Design a protein around this ligand. Structure first.
Ligand SMILES: Nc1nc2c(ncn2[C@@H]2O[C@@H]3COP(=O)(O)O[C@H]4[C@@H](O)[C@H](n5cnc6c(=O)[nH]c(N)nc65)O[C@@H]4COP(=O)(O)O[C@H]3[C@H]2O)c(=O)[nH]1
Lengths: 187, 187
């Protein structure tokens, strides 16, 4: 078959999200700077650009035209060996997002890395995955990932999927989602 | 859909095999000990047990009942960042395989890591993937991986897929494949 998105979503979960998401808040709290910070939403914001592509660096990127996003630092690494085959270390990037004259937000942002495979396939093997087929697979990936994560009680409230077109301002998108997050001051 | 194997094979390729396989021989040759060794087949032997499972350590494992496999060392690491999201280091394990009184072989062996996801699914989400459905997905994974790798000229002669039942002696299986490999003394 050609429905690559199903496999991408399941491996994204079992090979990463399943064990990083429940532990994320605790990992963040291991850093005093992060304990001290208010307006720090602890959910992982998983970024899903409709074009399966992004600048390697989020701050100042085409998705950040107003330069309101700044890299703050990384969380303390989680160590895990995968079936005794290879060793992995997992850590996440914290970003500051400006909110005018108010206190800026801190948040966890990450592009959905399985999208790299969709993009690579469309460029290296166009016969297997056309641009239009890639577009559709993004949607399939999103819907399956939603089903998987929503089926895991341990992941509840630990993430937020963010879909957007490449013409959008990520800072604006994120600011709105951060304000709509459950986190209140002192929380 | 439920055909997870397709996605597993494509990401295994684009996220790993596509860039490690063409460089493998060169990476191995960076170590003098490996340059000096004869009967060192430079192909990556990708192990695909029919049950999607293995002991973390290959030497002395249930797949090595005669204790003829020994860990020798790792290849020099390859560094690569994945879309600016996370940093990876790739390296491979070299094993010695006893050949009676003759000179023992050196080889590169590693289990097909996407099988971890198939196994994890069958145990954690049996409703999504039954034992019997997992068995079938192994076959789908194998055949799709074959199609992908055979379609990449840069990967030609750089790998060998090894399928076996868990009751088999991996040392016997490997000895057979090493002798049948193209590599000749001084090659
Ligand atoms: N943001 C973020 N995302 C992460 C991280 N770790 C994994 N992911 C995402 O989850 C996908 C599946 O990871 P996997 O279970 O290890 O599945 C792996 C694994 O089975 C295999 N593979 C990758 N690296 C190695 C390796 O070094 N050695 C071996 N033997 N297999 C590898 O290729 C498969 C697909 O690799 P990926 O393309 O990278 O695809 C990964 C990646 O998109 C992380 O630390 N941060």
């Amino acid at each position: 078959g050609s429905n690559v998105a199903d496999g991408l979503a399941w491996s994204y979960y079992f090979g990463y999200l399943k064990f990083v998401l429940p532990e994320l808040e605790k990992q963040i709290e291991k850093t005093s700077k992060f304990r001290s910070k208010e307006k720090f939403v602890k959910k992982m914001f998983i970024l899903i650009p409709s074009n399966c592509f992004w600048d390697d660096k989020i701050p100042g990127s085409d998705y950040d035209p107003q330069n309101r996003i700044t890299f703050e630092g990384n969380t303390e690494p989680l160590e895990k060996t995968r079936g005794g085959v290879f060793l992995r270390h997992y850590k996440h990037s914290v970003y500051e997002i400006k909110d005018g004259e108010n206190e800026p937000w801190f948040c966890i942002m990450e592009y959905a890395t399985p999208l790299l495979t969709l993009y690579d396939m469309s460029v290296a093997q166009p016969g297997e995955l056309s641009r239009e087929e890639r577009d559709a697979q993004v949607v399939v990936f999103l819907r399956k990932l939603q089903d998987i994560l929503e089926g895991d009680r341990a992941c509840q409230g630990k993430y937020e999927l963010v879909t957007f077109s490449p013409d959008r301002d990520l800072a604006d998108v994120m600011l709105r989602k951060l304000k709509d997050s459950e986190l209140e001051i002192g929380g």
